[PDB]
């Protein structure tokens with residue numbers, strides 16, 4: 146039997162899938178710690194690794210496999226179901242097994258995705274500081290027509306202080322925050338002017354290293370929900386430009402409160418893919 150994580154219906158992804166739109170033909174690149182490509186509930190089509198000593202189709206951490214599951218866990222009779230289960234999945238390793246990567250490695254991953262025609266780029270990662278090379282890479286990917294989504298950060302609140310990290314803080318990237326199954330913002334969600342939209346980030350059940358499934362907390366989990374949404378909006382209207390897909394997501398988001406804490410609100414893909 147196959148489980149449906151609360152995040153799927155909450156963002157109304159189930160309604161879009163039922164219409165027949167599941168992201169078929171859309172290329173999504175997950176810039177993470179890799180993916181356990183042999184997982185029975187995943188179908189990695191390709192990818193690349195910029196981490197020394199590790200191939201792209203192995204995940205020694207678990208993080209990348211969990212993020213990859215939220216976006217496209219296969220729709221079958223086992224495991225879980227992803228936001229866009231028919232998406233073309235590419236694993237781009239930019240982080241090591243301990244979950245950390247160098248700027249050059251990330252920038253290399255962003256460029257690889259831009260040159261290989263990826264439609265969406267999910268980056269469930271972030272640093273306190275940015276870099277001109279990284280900023281330039283995302284601006285260019287977005288300008289080339291790629292949707293760039295990034296985890297806002299698990300830094301929480303601090304009296305006015307903006308806690309959004311990079312690359313989420315760039316204009317060319319969608320900064321995603323986290324809400325729980327009750328739709329209340331999770332305590333660990335970063336807050337700041339750059340916050341754009343919210344998505345399920347707490348108690349998220351997804352695929353996990355060595356043919357299993359686990360629950361994780363973080364804006365790392367929220368991010369793949371938006372990348373999966375973008376893929377869904379694109380499989381229904383392959384004619385839209387990145388900024389158009391982007392605007393559809395925030396324009397139709399369900400308002401939750403002050404943009405400093407929730408951006409434009411919780412995403413509603415049934416409204417966005419209209």
Ligand SMILES: *C(=O)/C=C/c1ccccc1
Pocket residue numbers: 269270271272296297298299310311312313363364365366
């Ligand atoms: C996810 O677990 C970590 C995501 C992330 C993104 C940006 C800044 C810090 C951490």
Ligand SMILES: [Ca+2]
Pocket residue numbers: 147186218219220221222223224225226
């Ligand atoms: Ca499944």
